[PDB]
A paper describes a structure:
Two peptides - peptide #1 YLVVVGAVGV and peptide #2 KLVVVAVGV - shared a large portion of the KRAS5−6/8−14 G12V and KRAS5−14 G12V epitope candidate sequences. In contrast, peptide #2, which has the removal of residue G in position 6 as compared to KRAS5−14 G12V peptide and a G to V substitution at position 5 as compared to KRAS5−6/8−14 G12V peptide, is not competing with the reference peptide and thus ignored by TAP. Some structural differences in individual peptide binding were observed when comparing the 9 mer peptides (KRAS5−6/8−14 G12V [KL][VVGAVGV] and peptide #2 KLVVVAVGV) with the 10 mer peptides (KRAS5−14 G12V [KLVVVGAVGV] and peptide #1 YLVVVGAVGV). Comparison of peptides with a same length generally only reveals a single amino acid change in a similar orientation or the addition of a side chain, e.g., when V replaces G in peptide #2 as compared to KRAS5−14 G12V peptide. Specifically, while the N-terminal and C-terminal ends of all four peptides match perfectly, structural superposition reveals conformations in the middle portions of peptide KRAS5−6/8−14 G12V and peptide #2 unique from the remaining two peptide ligands (KRAS5−14 G12V and peptide #1). The superpositions of either KRAS5−6/8−14 G12V peptide and peptide #2 or KRAS5−14 G12V peptide and peptide #1 do not show any relevant differences.
Numbering used by the authors:
A (entry chain B): 1 to 99
B (entry chain C): 1 to 9
C (entry chain A): 1 to 274
Write the structure that this text describes.
Amino acid sequence: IQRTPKIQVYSRHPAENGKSNFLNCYVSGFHPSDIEVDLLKNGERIEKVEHSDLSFSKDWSFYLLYYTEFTPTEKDEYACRVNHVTLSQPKIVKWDRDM
Amino acid sequence: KLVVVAVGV
Amino acid sequence: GSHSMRYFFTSVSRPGRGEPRFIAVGYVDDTQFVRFDSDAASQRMEPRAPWIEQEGPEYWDGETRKVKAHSQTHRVDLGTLRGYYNQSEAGSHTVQRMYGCDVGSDWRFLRGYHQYAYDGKDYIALKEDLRSWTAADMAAQTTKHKWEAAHVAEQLRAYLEGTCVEWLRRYLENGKETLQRTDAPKTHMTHHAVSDHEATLRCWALSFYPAEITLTWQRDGEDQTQDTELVETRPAGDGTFQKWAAVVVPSGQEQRYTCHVQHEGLPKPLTLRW
Ligand code: NA
Ligand code: NA
Ligand code: NA
Ligand code: NA
Ligand code: NA
Ligand code: NA
């Protein structure tokens, strides 16, 4: 039983340039639990990234929240990069600030 | 509070 | 309304070297309050909510002893299940367990549950009567015979109707400032032109607790599902939740559409209109 992750990339608070916030990558609906999740700033892996403790849904599929403090700007691009046994290549999801 | 014993499958 | 205490356990075998990865999480409703991770430094049950930090050393020693005992049972189970399914020692496998109890609106025992999975599929589950088992396949039927002979359901029934609900009620009182507070969704609507002729209306529900919520679109007071999108409820990271629903509408006809928000923290459902 191999289920591919669903990915949402979003901020904790409505994004305003120059105002401290949290960047979230929520990965859900996956099995097995072994997964690689990085938050990217302009294509570069962010070092200070924490995640929730592994838990799971009624269908036994896993979910994790990965997050970091960040200050959004006009120019800087943020994304979530996810690798899992169900993916032929790492999946990159760009942060859209009304998603 | 957790259950005290977990019997094997 | 109802309240729940639930514990979630995951064990993943590591055939290359060493013992399984084991992660245990405890929740009251949608609030994590304890964790154990075999990979963490403490090798202790750890607090994850301020209201459990109240509990003294006997509590933390007791929960650490039990969660380590759970981890050893899961380690043995990964071996037993490899045997039952005639699988090689080379592959990684997963066991998952979830158990817990609900109290109702009357604050009395409502229901108990204990569910077990192997490689992400149902294995064995305690039925609602707490007296019988659902075994998915003949491996699980072997476990069911063993657990019938060992009176495991009687053991779990005593915990689920006793200790489980008593400690749930204790936690709900100790943590009442947050656990018995509802956070109604903060709602607003955004408008995004998709063409010269069409717009997306997005209905936002932010900073709500608990996670259970319903967002529905109506057009002229009738539910609409065509040309809608609903995202999975997601954690904000501060203990609250977020959700949105969107509909594509003809530009100039936005006023026909209403977003309806249902949540425990709303005396009456909210209606939003552009
Ligand atoms: Na721990
Ligand atoms: Na890890
Ligand atoms: Na630990
Ligand atoms: Na009772
Ligand atoms: Na499993
Ligand atoms: Na039994």
